[PDB]
Structure formats: C-alpha cells, structure tokens
Amino acid sequence: MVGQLSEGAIAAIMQKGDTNIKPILQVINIRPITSPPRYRLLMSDGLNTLSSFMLATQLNPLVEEEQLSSNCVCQIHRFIVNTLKDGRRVVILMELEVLKSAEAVGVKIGNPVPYNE
Amino acid sequence: GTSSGEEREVKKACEDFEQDQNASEEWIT
C-alpha cells in the first residue's frame, strides 16, 4: 500500500530542501560506484522516484550485510541536501533505520513515477 | 563524524554522483 510510504516527501525535498523530515521510503535499486564502494540509491516515496540519493559511507555495512537492499522499506533519520550548479539536488543519507526487509515487502509498492526535475 | 569530515564526504558524494554517467537509463538525471 502507498499508505505505508511518505507520499510527497521527494517533492518536498526537491522544492523546499528542508531536512527536518523523517520520511519513510522504499529502496527501488542500489548501484555501487568505484577506494571504498560508494552506494547510489533509487528510492520511492510511493508517488515519485528519485535517483540522486547517496549513502554515507558509515552506512555501507547495511548494504554489504544486505539489510538495506532493493524493495526494503526504510525511515530516514538524518540527511543532507546539496544543490548542484545545474539545479539538481543530491540527497546524502547519513542515518536510517530499515523498517521492513526486502523479503518481507516482496515487491515495489505502487507505481511511482520519476520526479521530473 | 566531525563537521569538516562530513562536509568533505558530502562533496565527495556529490562528485561521485556527477561523474556517474555510464549508468543505465533508470539512473539518468
């Protein structure tokens, strides 16, 4: 159910840039970038997806132990927004808690669409 | 976890993102 996710959080980050929210999001995909691997995440708030999430390196054990993996649901407890020269906003995830594992969720929630920058 | 250490990591994560051009279509921004 999309009622499980923080519908509109991605739009709020993209437009207002406020970090004082603790949104509940679903991981759609993770990709490593290579030095330690740095993880880039495609997340959903049930309404939109956005692929400019970057994982802080302190959180890498969640991915390497597969606690944070595609289709899991997590709650963000601390994030930093950085706005690039061209207007894109990068979201750096500092602290998060996985609320429901990928195994338990099983599937993408809803039919979110890419945020149109 | 210092303030300056976090700033350097935010900058690095942003450069990592900007140079990530060889990803598949779902990652295009």
Author numbering:
A (entry chain A): 1 to 34, 38 to 120
B (entry chain B): 2 to 6, 496 to 519
Published text:
The heterotrimeric Replication protein A (RPA) is the ubiquitous eukaryotic single-stranded DNA (ssDNA) binding protein and participates in nearly all aspects of DNA metabolism, especially DNA damage response. The N-terminal OB domain of the RPA70 subunit (RPA70N) is a major protein-protein interaction element for RPA and binds to more than 20 partner proteins. The RPA70N domain adopts an OB fold with a five-stranded anti-parallel beta-barrel but has very weak ssDNA affinity. Its primary role is to mediate protein–protein interaction with its basic and hydrophobic groove and a side pocket, as first shown by a series of studies of RPA70N interacting with p53.
HelB is a conserved helicase that is involved in DNA replication initiation, in replication stress responses and in negatively regulating DNA end-resection. A recent in vitro study showed that all ssDNA-dependent activities of HelB are greatly stimulated by RPA–ssDNA filaments. We crystallized a human HelB helicase peptide (HelBp1, residues 496–519) with the human RPA70N (residues 1–120) using the fusion strategy in space group P41212 and found that there is one molecule in the asymmetry unit. The curved β sheet of RPA70 and the extending L12, L45 loops form a shallow groove where the amphipathic helix of HelB sits. The hydrophobic residues V500, C504 and F507 of HelB pack against a broad hydrophobic patch formed by RPA70N I83, M97, I95, V93, L87 and M57. On the left side of the groove, W517 of HelB fits into a well-defined pocket (side-pocket) formed by the aliphatic portions of RPA70N N29, R31, R43 and S54. The overall binding mode of HelB to RPA70N is similar to that of DNA2. ITC titration results showed that mutation of W517 in HelB to alanine reduced the affinity between HelB peptide and RPA70N from around 4 μM to 16 μM, highlighting the contribution of side-pocket interactions to the overall binding strength.
